Design a protein around this ligand. Structure first.
Ligand code: CL
Ligand code: CL
Length: 120
């Protein structure tokens, strides 16, 4: 078997979109910086005890998305915060803009393929 980790779209306990990834916090936290780099997300600061990563996102060119194997997920370039939650054998990933806005269901849905590619 491979190093890929399963990724699914979900909602948090208030109904807002997030991703759920099939491995524990300790694994997903450690894998994230190099996986994020593949999809144009640079970690600029992080706090593991709070589960939070600050990311700056530069979208891939049309050809690079093609190489990765997912198309541009329709996220705006710029800064995001990524919150990594402990769900025992799984982890949650929830992106916010700097105003605290969560992704749309469509963006969050589009990031499922992006992150399955990044972890591969
Ligand atoms: Cl750079
Ligand atoms: Cl760390």
């Amino acid at each position: 078997a491979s190093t890929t980790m399963d990724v699914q779209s979900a909602a948090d306990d208030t109904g807002l979109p997030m991703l759920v990834v099939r491995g524990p916090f300790n694994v997903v936290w450690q894998r994230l910086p190099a996986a994020l780099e593949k999809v144009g997300m640079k970690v600029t600061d992080s706090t593991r005890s709070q589960g939070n990563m600050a990311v700056t996102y530069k979208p891939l060119s049309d050809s690079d998305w093609q190489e990765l194997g997912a198309s541009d997920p329709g996220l705006a370039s710029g800064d995001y915060k990524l919150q990594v939650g402990d769900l025992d054998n799984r982890s949650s990933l929830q992106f916010i803009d700097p105003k605290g806005h969560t992704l749309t269901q469509s963006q969050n849905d589009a990031l499922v393929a992006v992150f399955q590619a990044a972890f591969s």
